[PDB]
Amino acid sequence: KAALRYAAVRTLNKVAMKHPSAVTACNLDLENLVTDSNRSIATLAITTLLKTGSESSIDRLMKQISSFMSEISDEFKVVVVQAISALCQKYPRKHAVLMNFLFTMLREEGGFEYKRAIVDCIISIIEENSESKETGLSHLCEFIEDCEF
């Protein structure tokens, strides 16, 4: 049942925000959902795997998300941005790669809610990680040069 898989993955994605270690048991079943016909389920599975995964899996999973960014709705793009925010908290050493990805998404087409969620994520990374501050402020300065909002 697609609805039951969706409900389970969405709930696991919320658990993975608070208790990522508990969800790690489900990682094998979540990997099978990465190729689901429902792109919403696949996106929730990847974003859950990002929250629960190892630092070594980040570059592989980020590369898979970048291929789905064109096929997913803006609501699911916001869920991807929230997963990146949680990744920056968990793996502060990867902030430069994650900020460059967020900055690339900021240059692409997107609605107000999606652009807001990216800006909010960059601001959160700047507040939590002082080493990211100058780079994040520089990316926000480039964004305001062509900001429609």
Binding site: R107, E108, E109, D146, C147, E148, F149
Partner: peptide, 16 residues
């Protein structure tokens, strides 16, 4: 150095 800008202002101008 050639870039296509896809800002909300450029979309609204193109739609106008």
């Amino acid at each position: 150095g050639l870039v296509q800008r896809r800002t909300e202002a450029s979309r609204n101008a193109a739609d106008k």
